[PDB]
Amino acid sequence: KLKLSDWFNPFKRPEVVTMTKWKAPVVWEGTYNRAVLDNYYAKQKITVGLTVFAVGRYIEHYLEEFLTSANKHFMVGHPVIFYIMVDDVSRMPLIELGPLRSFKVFKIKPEKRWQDISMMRMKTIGEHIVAHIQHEVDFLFCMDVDQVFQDKFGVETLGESVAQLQAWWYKADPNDFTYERRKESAAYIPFGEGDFYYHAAIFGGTPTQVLNITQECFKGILKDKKNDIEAQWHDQSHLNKYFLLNKPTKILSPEYCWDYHIGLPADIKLVKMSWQTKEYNVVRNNV
Numbered sequence: 001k002l003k004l005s006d007w008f009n010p011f012k013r014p015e016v017v018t019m020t021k022w023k024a025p026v027v028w029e030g031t032y033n034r035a036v037l038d039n040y041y042a043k044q045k046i047t048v049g050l051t052v053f054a055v056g057r058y059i060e061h062y063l064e065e066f067l068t069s070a071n072k073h074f075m076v077g078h079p080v081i082f083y084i085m086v087d088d089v090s091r092m093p094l095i096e097l098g099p100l101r102s103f104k105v106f107k108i109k110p111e112k113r114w115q116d117i118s119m120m121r122m123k124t125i126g127e128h129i130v131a132h133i134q135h136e137v138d139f140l141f142c143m144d145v146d147q148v149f150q151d152k153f154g155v156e157t158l159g160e161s162v163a164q165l166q167a168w169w170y171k172a173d174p175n176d177f178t179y180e181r182r183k184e185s186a187a188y189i190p191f192g193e194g195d196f197y198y199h200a201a202i203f204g205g206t207p208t209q210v211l212n213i214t215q216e217c218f219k220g221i222l223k224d225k226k227n228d229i230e231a232q233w234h235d236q237s238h239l240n241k242y243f244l245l246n247k248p249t250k251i252l253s254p255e256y257c258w259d260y261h262i263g264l265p266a267d268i269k270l271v272k273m274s275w276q277t278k279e280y281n282v283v284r285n286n287v
């Protein structure tokens, strides 16, 4: 029975948003007591899962770097299982894993459009959660492969449902957010509504919550297809619609998924993960 005050101190970061109107903490460097959390979770003997997809040239361009960095920085001190989804297992980079890390790898069907490869992840993750992840871990994170861990990404990020603030918009107002604005889409968020602009590159929670996130998001994806419309920012638009309707119990600051192209302002004290430079001309095969 862990209590927020037991590990979260918002006063440590007075210059940023540390609490939502629905009482959810926004985890910033300096606000968390990882030692207290590590002991707490270690006593419960938790295991944390991490899913990552790599289809096409994303495999050669990002998978090794992602996995090598995850091995070194993700939930260190706790049992972790990496779930790798690739369309070609023969191109799977097999790196050496460290203490408390293991993995499995699954061959998936490569969708023709990169937009569907990104969106289909929602369906696939749900299938795997029901098939086995729900029986293997206490918490699960789903991440994009085009990024790299830079420092400790630990238990301070765990929660029922966890959302990530997108680096470029954490200081902007909702009406400036690139939410889906067409009412015909299931991801529609009207102007005048919205809390934050979440990044689909990182989200997680308990297997139960993530199953609901991926389900619902995929239902919206399929609905739009039936109405001959596709969200401008695909699964990210749908994920934002979901988190608006079902508020996350925990949010991570941009320090947990930073884009160095922005530079490094005062608010970003310690980067835990950074974006890989975009290389669409090579890794994507369609507009």
Ligand SMILES: O=c1ccn([C@@H]2O[C@H](COP(=O)(O)OP(=O)(O)O)[C@@H](O)[C@H]2O)c(=O)[nH]1
Pocket (backbone or CB within 6 Å): 052, 053, 054, 055, 056, 058, 114, 115, 117, 118, 143, 144, 145, 146, 201, 278, 283, 284, 285
């Ligand atoms: O052809 C593709 C398109 C997408 N993805 C996966 O889906 C995520 C979403 O895509 P991307 O990173 O290209 O989205 P962006 O962050 O640039 O919007 C990627 O990180 C990959 O894990 C993939 O493996 N192959």
Ligand SMILES: OC[C@H]1O[C@@H](O[C@H]2[C@H](O)[C@@H](O)[C@H](O)O[C@@H]2CO)[C@H](O)[C@@H](O)[C@H]1O
Pocket (backbone or CB within 6 Å): 166, 168, 178, 233, 236, 261
């Ligand atoms: O808007 C969703 C979309 O943002 C891309 O990042 C943009 C950012 O939104 C824009 O404000 C800035 O000027 O340029 C960035 C491109 O580097 C993300 O790359 C994309 O994945 C989505 O998250």
Ligand SMILES: [Mn+2]
Pocket (backbone or CB within 6 Å): 144, 145, 146, 201
């Ligand atoms: Mn990405």
